[PDB]
Every structure is written in structure tokens, then in C-alpha cells.
Amino acid sequence: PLLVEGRRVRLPQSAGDLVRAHPPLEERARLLRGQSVQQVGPQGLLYVQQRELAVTSPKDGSISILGSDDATTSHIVVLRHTGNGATCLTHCDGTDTKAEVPLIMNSIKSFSDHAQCGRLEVHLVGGFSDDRQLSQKLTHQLLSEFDRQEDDIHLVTLCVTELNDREENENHFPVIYGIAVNIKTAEIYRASFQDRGPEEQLRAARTLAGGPMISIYDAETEQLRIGPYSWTPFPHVDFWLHQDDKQILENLSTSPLAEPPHFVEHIRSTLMFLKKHPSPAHTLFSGNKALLYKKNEDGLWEKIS
């Protein structure tokens, strides 16, 4: 079940009510929202896209920081066992939360040396008070699915939906769009990411075409493993490529007035990828082999094999 200050959470309950009733949650939210955003560079970074999961631990010699950005109505989730340091960062968008929380749980529970030290801690950030209730629904689903687990999960950070909301000109949008977690130090902090590779377009197209949550990183081999992926041709991809920025925002975004400024440019490059690669399974991959990337000496991703 989900625990706050060592006791069970009553669900359903709004995130704001939870935070107001528990001073540790309120202080964490105040401090997190108050941080200035750090521009996290590529060294030791694994950037996790929407509908992806990455897990590793402090003995990883390649990755020291997990991060995700652009959480508009979606939530970034961090589950950490403070004893062995196993740390999973996930960017959930409400596609199938009941399937996705078990994936996060199993990614951490497989690490042993877990009984003698530490505990399971969970952190949830993202979203805002959006007109379509998408963030609030995601918050409820994540809290409920974690609370139905048998193991004790201690809720440490909760900065979602109404807690993550700001207003300008009667227009609401998120405060925190992105966070990083340092796996060695356990720090979780506000962050933005300019270097989101590798295979940024392939991975974005996989999710725009409707792919489910996937785990992208093999901590044992310190290998990023991309694909093989498959999809059918994206409907009306040429038509959407010919629409103007306002039409793309209103129809291809969950919240047209809350997206970050580069949203349309990002989706145009994803649509172009889909247009160029309507059937990637046997054109972008060989013999069903994943594309393999490892960190090089200077902390950048490099393709192997």
C-alpha cells in the first residue's frame, strides 16, 4: 500500500488534500517548485520519453542521471529503493496505468540487497488543472494502482495537477514540466534537457503511432536497447504535415494552450519520420535485433554492433 508519514493513505483523495494534510509532502512540494530549472547536459544522462521506463542503480558506470521533460498533462514517476539505490524513472501519460505501475514495481523489485537497508520511495510530478481532467484522472489512477500493491511504498514527492498549476491571463499550465534524478546522490530536481537522443524521432514516432510503455535500458550490460518496433501507416500523415501550427496544437495536443514552445516543431519532425517510415519493422532493424547504444568515454551515446 501507499504510505505517508508511515500510515496508509485514504483513497480517493485529491493530491492537494493529501499534501495539505501532511507537512513533509507540503515542504517537499514548496522546495521543488521553488527551484530554478537546471539545464542538464548529456554527460551520464539517460533521457526518458513519454511512455518509456528506465531503471538502473548506483553501480552503473555509464548512467548517473535519469530525466524527462514536457510533462503537460502527463506525470513523471520515480520509484527508488533507498537501500540498494535502484531507481526507475517513468513518464506516464494515462495510456494504461493499471499495466504500467506493475512494470515500474517489477523493475525495482528484481534488485536484491533490499532487506537490510532502506525502503521503497515514490515521487510523482507533472500535470496541471487542465479543462479535460486528464491530469487529475492520471493522478487518481497512479495513486490507486500503487496503493493496491502488497509492498509498502512511501510517498515522498507529490507535485501533480492542482499542486503543479499556475495561471496567466486566465490560462492554466504546469509549473514543473521536467525533472532529473541523480542516481548516486538520490537528488530529484527541476530540469530541462536539450540533448534527448539517441533515436529521438524513432522513439517519438513509436509512441505517436500508439505503442505501449516499454523499458529502454539494460542496466546489466549498460546498453540502451531501441526496438525493433512496428506500426501501420499513420493516418493522414501528409495532411497533418500541411496544417499550420494552430491546427496542429488544437488537434494533436491534449492541452493546446499549455504545451511548451517547441511542441509543434517536435511533432512535425515525428510526423515526417512516420511519413518516411510507414513500416519500420523490416526496414530499420535487421533480423529482429535491437539498436544498441552505449555511453562512450566522454559520456555521450554511441551506436554499437
Contact between 40 and 189 under an 8 Å Cβ cutoff? The reply is: no
* Cell 538502473, located at residue: 56
Note if the bond before 228 is cis, omega within 30 degrees. Answer: yes
What are the φ and ψ backbone dihedral angles of 62, each rounded to 5 degrees? -110, -40
Which string of DSSP letters, residue by residue, matches 65-86? EEEE---SSSEEEEEEETTT--
Task: Identify which of 303, 231, 301 has the alpha carbon closest to the alpha carbon of residue 271.
Answer: 231
Helix then strand count (H, E) for the chain reads: 8, 19
**Could you tell me which of 259, 254, 19 has the C-alpha nearest to residue 123?**
19
What letter represents residue 256's amino acid?
P
Q: What is the DSSP letter of 278?
A: S
Neighbouring residues of 231: CB distance < 8 A, sequence distance ≥ 6: 205, 206, 209, 210, 211, 274, 279, 280
**18 close to 25: Cβ distance less than 8 angstroms:** yes
Q: What type of residue sits at position 55?
A: V
Sign of CA dihedral 125, 260, 215, 231: positive
- One-letter amino acid of 136: Q
- Cβ burial 225-261 (10 Å sphere, 16+ → b, else e): ebbebebeebeebeebeebeeeebbeebbebeebbbe
Contacts 24+ apart (CB under 8 A), 214-219: 214/51, 214/52, 214/53, 215/52, 215/53, 215/54, 215/55, 215/103, 215/107, 216/46, 216/48, 216/52, 216/53, 216/54, 217/46, 217/54, 217/55, 217/56, 217/63, 219/55, 219/56, 219/57, 219/60, 219/63
In this structure, are residues 129 and 161 in contact, taking their beta carbons and an 8 Å threshold?
Answer: yes
Assign 281 to helix, strand or coil.
Answer: coil
Element containing residue 106 per DSSP (H, E): helix 97-109
β-pair partners for 65: 45, 182
The coordinates were experimentally obtained by: X-ray
C-alpha cell at 125: 510530478
Cα separations in angstroms, 102 against 98, 139, 234, 237, 264 = 7, 16, 29, 34, 32
List, as one string, the DSSP characters of 240-275.
HHTS-HHHHHHHHSSSTTTS-TTHHHHHHHHHHHHH
For residue 23, the surrounding DSSP H or E stretch is: helix 23-34
Question: Distance between CA 284 and CA 179 in Å, rounded?
Answer: 31
- Chain-centroid distance, C-alpha 152: 22
Q: How far is CA 78 from CA 87, 150, 155, 289, 293, in A?
A: 7, 18, 10, 29, 23
| DSSP class per residue in 111-145 | --S-SSS--EEEEEEE----TT-HHHHHHHHHHHH
Q: How many CB atoms lie within 10 A of CB 187?
A: 10
